[PDB]
Ligand binder design. Structure first.
Ligand SMILES: *C(=O)CCCCCCCCCCCCC
Lengths: 79, 122, 99, 128, 155, 65, 459, 177, 87
């Protein structure tokens, strides 16, 4: 029913591109008022998402190992 | 696909028209040419229920492949060698068709050269 | 310019009246007072009985009448054997091999 | 610069681009107040007739009956035959009829002439 | 219902227009009747010809589907402008620009298809060589008559 | 039980969906690699296409003129 | 046909002798028994008509119309027994008497051997319908609708009388069998032009032909439910049966005569259908749908091809049943909401699920969903007219859009959307209404299995 | 323009509406969060450039040109929330919002399986039919000459009095039936 | 699927979203704090805060209602009446 929220101290501005946006704004002379609200999206399990080539090559290592094992088995079972 | 460039963007009087081809008699520079031979008898090729588009010169390999497909059930990948043989025969037929195309192109070019000789001689 | 006291009071009054109605939508655990009222059946009462019915209706009511069910003649290859006649097809011509 | 919105019959001008919305004159203020008062009176009448516990039936809407009688039965008592209505009746009432009659007469004459000279393919046409 | 709460003829003088505006519960200035062309509109006012989608949906209406209040004098063609029918909402692009863009696009594609039909593409090979006089017997030709035989040779 | 909701963090994932996704990705890669090692023809090239203009003149029947 | 007339003449004292609470039950029971006995007319042949005596005969054309008529009368008694619950006992018995007399008149008209008997009975059908319309109608201006109906019918039918008496004095008889065996060709003369006009215009009035259809959008609206059903499902088919009988006698002039009239339908059934796109009254929408279907019937009969005849009779029966069901649906909704405005009652599916199912089935049968009878008839008409000419497929095909474009529209606004707030008297579905609509619908779906009995006289 | 309580939109309301719609369209055009945050800060700075103004006419055609620029730079397909009108899930479960008065048409056989709820509904109906008279008495006197000017309704004034015309708002159907 | 929400959780989430704002402080932020009178912010800050809760709770609040959500308890009240809490 009631869900307990975690602590708000953990959502920090650093570790993001949000601080880069903030310092570019400060170079032009503004400030970011919503760093902490958007800081949850880049902190935790969602940090360092894979690129598209990493997405396409998902499960390639075990598939290649099974391919090598199967081709060796069928190469040695012909004799 | 440079034949489209040689036929359309260049001049159209030297490249063959595939709608009407060949325009020359077969017995041009070909002493005792041979005739391509059927292997399947027309009754045997008829009761095998072949589609009229498939009823070309290489129907014998098609009959053999269909028989192998029938007998080797359920192992559908058991005798792909006959399929490869039929594909090779089709490839040879396509090679002969392309050779006919090149012969027609060379004969048209030679006719153009003959009319060029007539223009620059008479 | 926020809520004036009249509309704020009206919205508050309607708020707890709506909440009272919303909690009043809940039922007692006694409700509802409903009035008081073999592993492979699904493969037999749905399949085998229609199979028997359709097989009988096709065998003695459909195929009896002419041209209701038309079967394509099977493929015959050179070298095949026919059960109905017993005459074996002669093999085809000797192959002018290319490869 | 920018591409200015050109309104058409099927593409209305946006409400925030209207100059008349940006007018702060007093006459617009009294017009808005008067239409707000009219709408409030009609709304009050509706929810007075709507929340009655004794009433169990259809709340009569005079505007709906007015619209239906204007659409259905009040079109002929307010009709005057003039040149515009006569021209619109002659263009739309008999024009398509004579056009369709002419094209169908031409097509049927052509078909009958083709059939009676024995050129139309009617070999397998036995259902008519 | 009663007779004087119903539409009548076209008003001409100011006081008949005021009586009509009282009956139609609009202002005397917002009541603009249709012009007397003898079509049968009567004293029905001319609404500004807007769809019901143009009305704000966040307003609380008596009829939420039609976005129309109770007793609000509706348009003469309200059934044309319902939310399941012809709309008049503004578009991000101009209407004439939309029409000329679409017409130019379809005309250009049709012209390209025409010039491609005139100029085909193919593979530089000969025709499909068939046996038995280009398959005369299998094409439905009569076996009693012998047509002109074509013969396909080696190459 | 079911997966309990979480606030601004990664949702809890069991072993079954992870091993299912990994096994299916491995199966897909093994299938494509095995079919590429076995056939290798429909994608890379099946038959040698001969050059049209390189045919010799004596077998195509054009007289020397 | 003296085995059916005498049961109705005995039904007349049966409703003049019952108690004040037992008229409806006794009349319904005995009319359903007569409807059960009505099936004996199906002893037909592919080459001969079933003749009983010198005055009554019935081929494979009039038999489905007879069955529909004396099947519709019990449905009429069910549909009209609630809104007359406040009436006087004498007026209630008079209403049942007019309905019984109308059924007797129709079953005597449909089996008329000779054409003059058919004409006099055809004009005699005017009286109870006019009485019902001008007496038990609800709206104020029902007198105008009754006068328009009576005068359109009479002004059509009096030149028909003159032409029929002229034909009888010329050749010698008006029996349909004799005229089948004593037919004479009519040459292309102006006398034969006016003969064709006099023999046709009555039936073009009662079909109704487009242009002369103005008596339908009034008399179908302000009339009660029984009068609406007898106007929509029988009398138009009475005119169609009369035109089918008459058009045998007018060959070969019609082959160059029916060019305008056919095309007077071939465009009209377009734009009248477009009127259903912009109608605020549901009953007027149903009436204009009937106008479109009868225009299709006009085209099919006037081109006089066999497949057109089969499509005409099939579409006649299917459209009669569908229009009766739609009129009953309109009457039930009008009883519940006390208004004929279509835009008023919305979202009825959330309150009335079974009535929404009946609405869906009626709308689907109205748009010619196969394999119903309406699709069979309209498809046969389209085949026959495409045999007549090519381009006319367009003039049918666009109609194939517009019919759907109103019928499902009639399904949407009355059923789909947010329900009306101030309407809170929507009672649950009465068992009488559900019984009446099932009795309307189930015979159509059952005849979809075996349509060979309603495909005309020449099947 | 068209508001329930006020007869017109002031300059502040127009500016705030333009700001909110501009932020929504900018979030639609700037899908990634950081680009959206940067350009939202830029747009807030642009709005604060002309915040302190003293001429009403200058603010008037500045708002006119700002609205023209916003119309030029709008997203052709703006992001719409699922419950907002125009969304994919807008008024979907409104098809299942059966009104409460249909419960008055139930059979006594199907009314016997929810006894306590129908007893509480009877109590609520009695409360409505005893509150209607004093609520219309309250609304009669409070209404001035010519009817009410605004659509706002007066609240409950006396103790023990329910607000006027409260039934069709308190007993409106739930969002998730 | 679709877990229910309680009013205590509603004000907890609203105070959580408010307490991450950089133009506000987490000390004098309370549930009965007026945004300009008792807290000292701008109208632009008000509409932007309303947009922040509109993004947070996943539905659109209209401007006519948005101008009056002037305290955190009133925002909780509007969310409560919209989402039908305490059922
Ligand atoms: C000459 O070009 C012969 C080849 C066939 C005609 C041209 C086909 C062009 C499109 C397919 C190839 C695309 C290569 C990027």
């Amino acid at each position: 029913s009631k869900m307990e929220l975690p602590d708000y101290k953990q959502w920090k501005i650093e570790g993001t591109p949000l601080e880069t946006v903030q310092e570019k704004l400060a170079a032009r002379g503004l400030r970011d008022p919503w760093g902490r609200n958007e800081a949850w999206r880049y902190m935790g399990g969602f940090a360092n998402n894979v690129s598209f080539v990493g997405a396409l090559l998902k499960g390639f290592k075990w598939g290649f190992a099974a391919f090598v094992v199967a081709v060796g088995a069928e190469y040695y079972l012909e004799s | 696909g440079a034949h489209l460039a040689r036929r359309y963007l260049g001049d159209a009087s030297v490249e063959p028209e595939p709608l009407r081809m060949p325009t020359f008699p077969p017995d041009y520079g070909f002493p005792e040419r041979k005739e391509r031979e059927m292997v399947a008898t027309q009754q045997e090729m008829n009761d095998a229920q072949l589609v009229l588009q498939q009823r070309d010169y290489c129907a014998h390999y098609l009959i053999r492949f269909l028989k192998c497909k029938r007998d080797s059930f359920p192992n559908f990948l058991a005798c792909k060698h006959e399929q490869h043989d039929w594909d090779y025969c089709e490839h040879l037929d396509y090679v002969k068709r392309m050779k006919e195309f090149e012969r027609e192109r060379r004969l048209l070019q030679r006719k153009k050269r003959r009319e060029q000789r007539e223009a620059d001689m008479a | 310019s926020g809520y004036t006291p009249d509309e704020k009071l009206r919205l508050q009054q309607l708020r707890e009246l709506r909440r009272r109605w919303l909690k009043d939508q809940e039922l007692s655990p006694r409700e509802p007072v409903l009035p008081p009222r073999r592993h492979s059946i699904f493969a037999f009462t749905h399949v085998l009985i229609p199979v028997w019915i359709i097989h009988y209706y096709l065998k003695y009511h459909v195929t009896t009448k002419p041209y209701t069910i038309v079967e394509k003649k099977p493929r015959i290859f050179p070298g095949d054997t026919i059960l109905e006649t017993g005459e074996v097809i002669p093999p085809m011509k000797e192959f002018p091999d290319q490869h | 610069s920018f591409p200015k919105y050109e309104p058409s019959r099927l593409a209305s001008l946006p409400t925030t681009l209207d100059p008349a919305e940006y007018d702060i004159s007093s006459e617009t203020r009294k017009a808005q107040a008067e239409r707000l008062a009219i709408r409030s009176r009609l709304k009050r009448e509706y929810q007075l007739q709507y929340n009655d516990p004794s009433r169990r039936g259809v709340v009569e809407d005079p505007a709906l009956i007015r619209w239906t009688c204007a659409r259905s039965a009040n079109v002929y008592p307010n009709f005057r035959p003039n040149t515009k209505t006569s021209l619109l009746g002659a263009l739309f009432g008999i024009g398509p009829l004579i056009f369709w009659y002419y094209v169908f007469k031409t097509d049927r004459d052509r078909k009958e002439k083709l059939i009676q000279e024995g050129k139309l393919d009617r070999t397998f046409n036995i259902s008519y | 219902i009663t007779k004087d709460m119903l539409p009548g003829p076209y008003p001409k003088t100011p006081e008949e227009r005021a009586a009509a505006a009282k009956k139609y519960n609009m202002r005397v200035e917002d009541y603009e009747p249709y012009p007397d062309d003898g079509m049968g509109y009567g004293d029905y006012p001319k609404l500004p010809d807007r769809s019901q989608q143009e009305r704000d949906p966040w307003y609380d209406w008596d009829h939420p589907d039609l976005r129309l209040n109770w007793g609000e004098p509706m348009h003469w063609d309200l059934d044309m402008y319902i939310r399941n029918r012809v709309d008049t909402s503004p578009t991000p692009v101009n209407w004439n620009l939309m029409c000329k863009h679409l017409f130019g696009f379809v005309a250009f594609m049709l012209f390209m298809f025409w010039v491609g039909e005139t100029y085909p593409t193919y593979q530089p090979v000969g025709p499909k060589q068939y046996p038995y006089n280009n398959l005369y017997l299998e094409r439905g030709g009569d076996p009693n008559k012998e047509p002109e035989p074509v013969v396909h040779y080696e190459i | 039980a079911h997966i309990e909701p979480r606030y601004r963090q990664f949702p809890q994932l069991t072993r079954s969906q992870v091993i299912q996704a990994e096994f299916f990705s491995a199966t897909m890669w093994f299938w494509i690699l095995w079919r590429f090692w076995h056939d290798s023809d429909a994608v890379l090239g099946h038959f040698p296409y001969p050059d049209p203009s390189q045919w010799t003149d004596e077998e195509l029947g054009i007289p020397p003129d | 046909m003296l085995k059916y007339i005498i049961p109705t003449m005995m039904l007349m004292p049966l409703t003049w002798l019952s108690k004040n609470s037992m008229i409806w039950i006794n009349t319904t029971l005995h009319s359903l028994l007569i409807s059960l006995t009505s099936l004996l007319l199906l002893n037909q042949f592919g080459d001969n008509s079933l003749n009983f005596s010198l005055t009554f005969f019935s081929d494979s054309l009039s038999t489905p119309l007879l069955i529909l008529t004396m099947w519709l009368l019990p449905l009429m008694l069910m549909a009209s027994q609630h809104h007359l619950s406040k009436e006087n006992l004498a007026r209630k018995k008079l209403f049942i008497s007019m309905l019984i007399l109308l059924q007797l008149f129709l079953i005597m008209t449909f089996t008329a051997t000779e054409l003059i008997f058919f004409y006099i009975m055809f004009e005699a059908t005017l009286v109870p319908t006019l009485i019902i319309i001008t007496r038990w109608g609800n709206q104020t201006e029902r007198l105008n609708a009754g006068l328009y109906f009576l005068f359109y019918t009479l002004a059509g039918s009096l030149p028909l009388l003159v032409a029929l008496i002229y034909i009888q004095n010329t050749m010698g008889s008006l029996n349909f069998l004799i005229l089948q065996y004593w037919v004479q060709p009519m040459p292309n003369s102006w006398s034969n032009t006016f003969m064709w006009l006099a023999c046709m215009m009555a039936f073009m009035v009662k079909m109704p032909l487009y242009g002369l259809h103005l008596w339908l959008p009034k008399a179908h609206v302000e009339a009660p439910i029984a009068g609406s059903m007898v106007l929509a499902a029988i009398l138009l088919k009475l005119g169609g049966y009369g035109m089918m009988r008459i058009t045998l006698l007018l060959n070969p002039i019609t082959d160059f005569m029916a060019y305008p009239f056919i095309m007077l339908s071939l465009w009209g059934m377009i734009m009248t259908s477009s009127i259903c796109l912009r109608q605020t009254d549901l009953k007027s929408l149903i009436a204009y749908s009937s106008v479109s279907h009868m225009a299709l019937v006009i085209v099919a009969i006037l081109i006089q091809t066999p497949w057109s005849y089969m499509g005409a009779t099939a579409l006649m029966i299917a459209h009669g049943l569908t229009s009766s069901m739609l009129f009953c649906l309109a009457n039930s909704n009008y009883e519940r909401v006390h208004s004929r405005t279509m835009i008023l009652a919305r979202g009825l599916q959330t309150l009335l699920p079974l009535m929404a199912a009946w609405w869906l089935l009626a709308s689907l049968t109205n748009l010619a969903l196969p394999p119903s009878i309406n699709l069979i008839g309209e498809l046969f008409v389209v085949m026959s007219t495409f045999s007549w000419s090519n381009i006319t497929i367009i003039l049918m095909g666009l109609n194939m859009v517009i019919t759907a474009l109103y019928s499902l529209y009639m399904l949407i606004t009355t059923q789909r959307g947010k329900h009306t707030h101030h309407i809170n008297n929507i009672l649950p579905s009465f068992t009488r209404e559900n019984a009446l609509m099932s009795l309307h619908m189930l015979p159509l779906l059952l005849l979809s299995l075996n349509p060979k009995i309603i495909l005309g006289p020449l099947y | 323009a068209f508001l329930p309580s006020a007869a017109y939109l002031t300059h502040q309301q127009k500016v705030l509406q333009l700001y909110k719609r501009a932020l929504r369209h900018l979030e639609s055009r700037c899908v990634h969060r950081d680009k959206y945050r940067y350009f939202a800060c830029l747009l807030r700075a642009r709005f604060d450039e002309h915040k302190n103004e003293k001429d009403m006419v200058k603010a008037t055609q500045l708002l006119r040109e700002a609205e023209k620029e916003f119309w030029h730079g709008q997203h052709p397909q703006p992001y719409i929330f699922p419950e907002s009108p125009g969304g994919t899930s807008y008024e979907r479960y409104e098809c299942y919002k059966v009104p409460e008065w249909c419960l008055d048409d139930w059979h006594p056989s199907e009314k016997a399986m929810y006894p306590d709820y129908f007893a509480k509904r009877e109590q609520w109906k009695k409360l409505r039919r005893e509150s209607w008279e004093r609520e219309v008495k309250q609304l009669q006197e409070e209404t001035p000459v010519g009817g009410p000017r605004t659509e706002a309704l007066p609240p409950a004034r006396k103790q023990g009095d329910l607000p006027p015309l409260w039934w069709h708002i308190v007993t409106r159907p739930r969002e998730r039936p | 699927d679709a877990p229910p929400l309680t009013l205590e959780g509603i004000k907890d989430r609203v105070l959580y979203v408010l307490k991450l704002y950089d133009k506000i402080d987490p000390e004098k932020l309370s549930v009965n704090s007026h945004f300009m009178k008792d807290l000292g912010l701008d109208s632009l800050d008000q509409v932007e805060i309303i947009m922040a809760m509109e993004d947070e709770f996943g539905f659109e609040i209209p401007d006519i209602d948005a101008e009056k959500l002037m305290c955190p308890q009133e925002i909780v009240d509007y969310i409560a009446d919209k989402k039908d809490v305490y059922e």
